RNA sequence: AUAGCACUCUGCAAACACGAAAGUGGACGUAUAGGGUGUGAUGCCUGCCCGGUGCUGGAAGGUUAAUUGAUGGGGUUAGCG
């Protein structure tokens, strides 16, 4: 429902939260939860590689089954949690025979509900088949790239691929990019949407907000002195160059893709 | 610096960064995500110019490297003298 605060003080006049009444107010199911430690950005030789991450919020990895590898047993879904290692919402599945597990939750679905994955699953939301027999013009999310490795593509809040056609030994889909590719035909996805669609309706208000989902601040390279960055230097405002990165890659418009190896795969670009 | 705004790049063995390499961060994330750049709550808004430099897409005409080696010109000596 996007609900407004009353500006009752300065940080909260600009606070836009998205409420869901649906979700598991308790704990996570503990034998599917682990340990994840934060990292500042920083790899094995200790040098800073990503620059503006640090701090925010203590978080469990929760262990999701991005595979659907259980074929031909009926599951049902327990409850619907909030994940903080991602911007979808999560489903607890429980088999017939007792089994229990994790799962991108697709929208729509409740407590209560069938899920199934194989090659004879019905044509139901959250069910996993393989592409060669999903019906064309269907919405799908949670696409596998490699046979057996798992769902890569459309995974983040709200996100769906459509499926345009099938030939041969590829099928054709379009992602949420605007891109054309073919993927085999062997490959497996999920009929529905991803949930969480008013993901980005949210509004942070202040700097804080930022500073607890794990954001550092971002310096212009504008404000720094010759040695630090290109654009430094010059007595008062002054740009007088065109744009690069600390690096010296230019920023706007120059393309940086490389790969030779899966340029056969694309038919349509998005006009990168 | 900031929440908000915009441009641009990146289809996943991602772009990008560290490193001589192996490898590591990005991220046990997947375009509602991640990196770079500028502006800076909010209200009203944000005009003209693509000639220059840059970027993006074209063309197969001119010019051009390694490589290849067609012809031509010298040195030497069998022999003729």
Aim: aromatic share 4%; with cysteine.
């Amino acid at each position: 429902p996007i609900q407004k605060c009353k500006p009752t003080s300065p940080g909260r006049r600009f606070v836009e939260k998205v409420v869901h009444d649906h979700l598991h107010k308790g704990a996570p199911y503990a034998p599917l939860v682990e340990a994840k430690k934060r990292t500042g950005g920083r790899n094995n030789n200790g040098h800073i590689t990503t620059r503006h991450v640090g701090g925010g919020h203590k978080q469990h990895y929760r262990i999701v089954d991005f595979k659907r590898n259980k074929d031909g047993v009926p599951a049902v879904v327990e409850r619907i949690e909030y994940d903080p290692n991602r911007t979808a919402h999560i489903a607890l599945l429980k088999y017939a025979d007792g089994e229990r597990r994790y799962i991108i939750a697709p929208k729509g679905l409740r407590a209560g509900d069938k899920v199934q994955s194989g090659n004879d699953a019905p044509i139901r939301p959250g069910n996993c088949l393989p592409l060669r027999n999903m019906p064309i013009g269907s919405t799908l999310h949670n696409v596998e790239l490699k046979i057996g490795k798992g769902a890569q593509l459309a995974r983040s809040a709200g996100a769906s691929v459509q499926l345009l056609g099938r030939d041969g030994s590829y099928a054709i889909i379009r992602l949420r990019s605007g891109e054309m590719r073919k993927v085999h035909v062997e490959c497996r996805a999920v009929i529905g949407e991803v949930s969480n669609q008013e993901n980005n309706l949210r509004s942070l208000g202040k700097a804080g907000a930022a500073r607890w989902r794990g954001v550092r601040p971002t310096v212009r390279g504008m404000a720094m002195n010759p040695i630090d960055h290109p654009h430094g230097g010059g007595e008062g405002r002054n740009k007088g160059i065109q744009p690069v990165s600390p690096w010296g890659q230019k920023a706007k418009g120059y393309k940086t893709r490389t790969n030779k190896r899966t340029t056969k795969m694309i038919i349509r670009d998005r006009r990168v």
